[PDB]
Structure 1
Amino acid sequence: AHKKGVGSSKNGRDSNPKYLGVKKFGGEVVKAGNILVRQRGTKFKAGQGVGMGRDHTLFALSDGKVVFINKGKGARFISIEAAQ
């Protein structure tokens, strides 16, 4: 005859997107309160001027400009420095 199957599936599961990645990049300005990076862990280390919420989010403590540094591959921070 024809087909009766009968198989199902046990997967077909996923979770709605977590918008990670670096939000504010390197060489652009900032305001105070402005978030510069979202991340799962310490993908980006709190530098001089920046704070780290519970998420390990990176937020700006005062205005100015954004400074990225990777420390020769695997250790890395973002800092802030004003317009003077």
Structure 2
Amino acid sequence: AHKKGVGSSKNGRDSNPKYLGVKKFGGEVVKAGNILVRQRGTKFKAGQGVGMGRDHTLFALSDGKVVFINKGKGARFISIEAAQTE
């Protein structure tokens, strides 16, 4: 009443990462960028990454959310010109 060996055979299961909302769309106080949950969002867009430059999301409200390192936590604000006096 056990299990065997020499049959590696070991399928893998599912995930579901994304950039949801990609860069520069109607910004809604909701899941910003994703690739590491428990995540700790940030302020506006993010531009820090194992790449160099940065990314703007011409979309501004409360905040977004990170992914733990990847992408690059937000902080470089960027409400967007669409955040002035009505």
Write the distance in 2 (CA, Å) between the matches of 1:39 and 1:10: 30
Indicate if the aligned counterparts of 1:50 and 1:80 stay in contact, CA closer than 8 A: no
Mean Cα displacement is larger for which, 11-20 or 29-38?
29-38
Structure with the larger strand share: 1
Structure 1 segments unaligned to the other structure (5+ residues): none
Structure 2 segments unaligned to the other structure (5+ residues): none
Indicate if the aligned counterparts of 1:45 and 1:78 stay in contact, CA closer than 8 A: yes
Write the distance in 1 (CA, Å) between the matches of 2:2 and 2:66: 66
CA drift of 1:40 comes to 6.6
Aligned position for 1:30: 30
Indicate if the aligned counterparts of 2:42 and 2:64 stay in contact, CA closer than 8 A: no
Aligned position for 1:42: 42
CA drift of 1:61 comes to 6.2
Q: Any idea what the Cα deviations from partners look like across 1:39-81, whole Å, max 9, x if unmatched?
A: 9722746999999999999954699999999999973111222
Write the distance in 2 (CA, Å) between the matches of 1:60 and 1:32: 11
Relative to structure 1, the CA distance from residue 48 to residue 55 in structure 2 (aligned partners, 3 Å threshold; closer, same or farther) is closer
Relative to structure 1, the CA distance from residue 21 to residue 5 in structure 2 (aligned partners, 3 Å threshold; closer, same or farther) is same
Percent of residue pairs identical: 100
Q: TM-score, normalised by structure 1?
A: 0.26
CA RMSD of aligned residues (A): 11.6
Aligned position for 1:74: 74
Relative to structure 1, the CA distance from residue 43 to residue 52 in structure 2 (aligned partners, 3 Å threshold; closer, same or farther) is farther
Write the distance in 2 (CA, Å) between the matches of 1:58 and 1:49: 18
Relative to structure 1, the CA distance from residue 13 to residue 32 in structure 2 (aligned partners, 3 Å threshold; closer, same or farther) is closer
